[PDB]
Design an enzyme around this catalytic site. Sequence first.
Site, short mmCIF file in Angstrom:
data_model
loop_
_atom_site.label_atom_id
_atom_site.label_comp_id
_atom_site.label_asym_id
_atom_site.label_seq_id
_atom_site.Cartn_x
_atom_site.Cartn_y
_atom_site.Cartn_z
N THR A 16 -26.56 -30.77 7.97
CA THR A 16 -25.32 -31.03 7.25
C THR A 16 -25.54 -31.38 5.78
O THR A 16 -24.55 -31.54 5.05
CB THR A 16 -24.53 -32.15 7.93
N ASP A 39 -33.42 -0.93 7.90
CA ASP A 39 -34.02 -1.23 6.60
C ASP A 39 -35.20 -0.29 6.35
O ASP A 39 -35.14 0.88 6.72
CB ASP A 39 -34.44 -2.71 6.61
N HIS A 69 -39.76 -4.91 2.40
CA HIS A 69 -38.43 -5.51 2.49
C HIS A 69 -37.96 -5.67 3.94
O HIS A 69 -37.49 -6.74 4.35
CB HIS A 69 -37.46 -4.66 1.65
N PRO A 175 -13.93 -4.82 6.59
CA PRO A 175 -13.43 -6.12 7.06
C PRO A 175 -13.96 -6.54 8.42
O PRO A 175 -14.06 -7.75 8.68
CB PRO A 175 -11.91 -5.93 7.11
N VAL A 177 -16.90 -6.38 9.93
CA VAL A 177 -18.27 -6.86 10.08
C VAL A 177 -18.38 -8.19 9.36
O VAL A 177 -17.42 -8.66 8.75
CB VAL A 177 -19.30 -5.83 9.59
N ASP A 260 -19.30 -27.31 0.67
CA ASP A 260 -20.53 -27.90 0.17
C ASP A 260 -21.19 -27.10 -0.96
O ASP A 260 -22.09 -27.62 -1.61
CB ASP A 260 -21.50 -28.13 1.32
#
Length: 279
Positions: A16, A39, A69, A175, A177, A260
């Site tokens: 947290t 990838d 990568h 939208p 995914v 945060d």
Amino acid sequence: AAQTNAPWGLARISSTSPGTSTYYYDESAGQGSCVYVIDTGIEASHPEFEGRAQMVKTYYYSSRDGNGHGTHCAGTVGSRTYGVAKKTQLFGVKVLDDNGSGQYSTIIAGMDFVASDKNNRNCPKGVVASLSLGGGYSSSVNSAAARLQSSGVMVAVAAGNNNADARNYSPASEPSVCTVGASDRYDRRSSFSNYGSVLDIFGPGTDILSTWIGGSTRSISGTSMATPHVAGLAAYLMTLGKTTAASACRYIADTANKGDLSNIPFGTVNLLAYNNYQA
Ligand SMILES: NC[C@H]1CC[C@H](C(=O)O)CC1
């Protein structure tokens, strides 16, 4: 379970608060789930994968990751030291060549491949796909990502690295995914991270240590690095039975650390992936 002296992003996922270094997670660790890394490939022989990684498809003369990568992303999903889901099965789909480049037609074929191939694999706890790639908007690319999600795979995609609105990038702008932005170890939006209303969640993306080719390790940055944190988190939560492939993005957003992050543009979610683990 506790992993001391972990990379900062794993510690952040299980905290947290920023500024801690131990990763805490249930010992089930994603066992019985499987994550496809779409990838440049995965160096499956890297000791960090412990036999749990395997190339399943390539569109090029070799299945080897000659770039690094894909191996780095796979390491953040599921390597023993650098991974979120330390017991998941990793499956490599090489849609990018060793320079990191690939045609959209090949990327689409790789997504359709995963939607079918998952039915040849044993993944009783669920299936995830991590897509640390993208380019300019394409309806065909977004549709392929939406098909893969609809087939029963939790699809996590990078928002992009242009410090721009992700609505103009694919598959980031699809939208259905889970579109992932990047943060740094001080809970700031990463300087390069795309933003916008299409983002679903942020994960650690600046200075991420993971596996590399040649049996090595290195730190690199990108929304490409935040995406496998979320993909590995999804596999971990699915194995615990907390969520499903169709609902995991919403569940991760519902349970995220909220408010945060700094330098979040107005209109972009202020949500940081969090595993909510209590020992
Ligand atoms: N949905 C297909 C894929 C997910 C698990 C399934 C199973 O384990 O029964 C087979 C492979």
